[PDB]
Amino acid sequence: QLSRADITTVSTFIDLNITMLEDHEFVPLEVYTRHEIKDSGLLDYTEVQR
């Protein structure tokens, strides 16, 4: 009696590798926050009047 792995084996199937799409996490990103846009002005009427 001999084991099943003692004889050479050939794959009769046509392998098809399937790599699922990895999960992705999106982080917040802004070129200019609303605070930066407000600060872009040279003068602010609110602060000047205050």
Partner 1 sequence: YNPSRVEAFHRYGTTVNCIVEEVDARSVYPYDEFVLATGDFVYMSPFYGY
Ligand X SMILES: *[C@@H]1O[C@H](CO)[C@@H](O)[C@H](O)[C@H]1NC(C)=O
Which residues bind to partner 1, rule: CB under 8 A?
42-43, 47-48
Residue 49, classified by CB atoms within 10 Å of its CB into exposed (0-12), middle (13-18) or buried (19+), is exposed
In the bound state with ligand X, the residue whose beta carbon lies nearer, of 5 and 29, is: 5
- In the block, tokens 């699922």 appear at 20
One of 10, 14, 15, 30 touching ligand X (CB under 6 A): 15
| Shortest reach from residue 16's CB to ligand X, in Å | 7
Tokens of 14: 């046509």
User: From partner 1, ligand X, none, which one binds at residue 25 (CB under 5 to 8 Å depending on kind)?
Assistant: none
